[PDB]
């Protein structure tokens, strides 16, 4: 497996729920980057160096993902709820002495990120979310068209062992097909082959796949219920926010986030749903300018 | 594989879209029975003998299912649309000299049946649909709760080869889990083990699994569009109709099925029966009685 982060160290960070793995580089104000599904921290390999010019950049594997430990789940999928993941990553950041930091997330990591901002806004100076709407909004939008487009939200959330059993027959094909399907190009050409190998190796492990299903089960149930409480309470994120999204993938995303946050700017980028790899120069530029 | 219709004949019926396999028994008015997913004609084995006491019973494998031929599909999934399946089965019935007949369908076969009644009502004396609402009605109900409870409508409709690839690793496990999960009890006890082996063997063929995926792809697209045209036009089935459904099945999930069917048909009756989604196997005496009384 290739080292795709020149000048970055490798850290295992202890928490009460298990170790969080991170690549760490740069100096200056602290910036945490959180990947999503079906990827690992290495999805930031194209943009993290530009960020590390100006920030101390911490590129973490989500709880249960990549090389992070996998806490044992339960009947409500608790450690893979975004609330729980946010609490664990707040603990990890405290181990480094970071109790107020900047945060950017993509996909599931962006879900952790806006949940973190709702639950513990004092932890964040600035927030970026990439290629997402709140989990509540996806579910509110779930008609025939959406059930077909984002079928994996219901499929991966089916009670165990249904998706686990299916995913084990040929995991390489499934993860490579998802990676390609969600890009503008519809193939693997936006990715570094070395990064695809990281994703494939992670996805090849049945325990790692079970975590992903627990993540989507949380997304269908507890995450949705947490979001619903905020909607009903009229809670809006007060942290300055940036919403970025691939125009060919979230997509009016800024209209949606304005209902969820009181200080948000945003922009589409010509890309599918893997912005930091499909449009790394654009994405890095927007993030550097926002966080500075 | 076992003979579950002892005494019944067999036919391999030619049509422009491929052969239809059927077991044929009894004597009297013609009655066609159409199975669904993930099953074959043998799911009628517990009610078919009783019906054969009063009707000429034709127990057919759906186009692409069981031992019927599997036509090559196309970009619109045409031969596995319920419109096309109904045309094909109309041809098959004509080969037998049946141009006006009674019809009962279950699950996908019931979808073929109500589409048949919408496109070609003159072909049916009476119609029974088991364990279903119209395809349009399931999609209209699509929200979070529904998407989570009936995931396979969207899963199996994903573009090929995604579900085919997933189902190929351990097909026995998936189909046996579907059969058990959709029964009242949640196990395989409602089935004759010999019938389960018919279902398992069919599902073990990748070409048969591909057909099933095409069926659900049609169900997500062309079948839905066909249904949408009829309900937006206010078209109702004029053929006298019976709707039966298992109380624990998904046709009675977020709907009162008879009220749904009254939107689609101008002369409909029906009733729930205590059962999951496999009425003719889970509640055979009750199902057989309802059908005999209705078609008589
Ligand atoms: Cl998604």
UniProtKB/Swiss-Prot annotation, chain A:
Site entry: Important for enzyme activity: 131
Gene3D superfamilies, per database record: alpha/beta hydrolase
Positions bound to fluoroacetate: 108, 111, 152-153, 216
Pfam family, one: Abhydrolase_1
EC number: 3.8.1.3
Assigned keywords, A-Z: Hydrolase
Residue intervals of the AB hydrolase-1 domain: 29-263
Recorded catalytic activity of this chain's protein: a haloacetate + H2O = a halide anion + glycolate + H(+); fluoroacetate + H2O = fluoride + glycolate + H(+); chloroacetate + H2O = glycolate + chloride + H(+)
Outcome (variant: residue 152 to N): Reduced catalytic rate with fluoroacetate, but increased catalytic rate with chloroacetate. Minor effect on substrate affinity
Self-association state and partner proteins as the record states: Homodimer.
Function: Catalyzes the hydrolytic defluorination of fluoroacetate to produce glycolate. Has lower activity towards chloroacetate and bromoacetate.
Protein name, as recorded: Fluoroacetate dehalogenase
Species this protein is from: Rhodopseudomonas palustris (strain ATCC BAA-98 / CGA009)
Source taxonomy: Bacteria, Pseudomonadati, Pseudomonadota, Alphaproteobacteria, Hyphomicrobiales
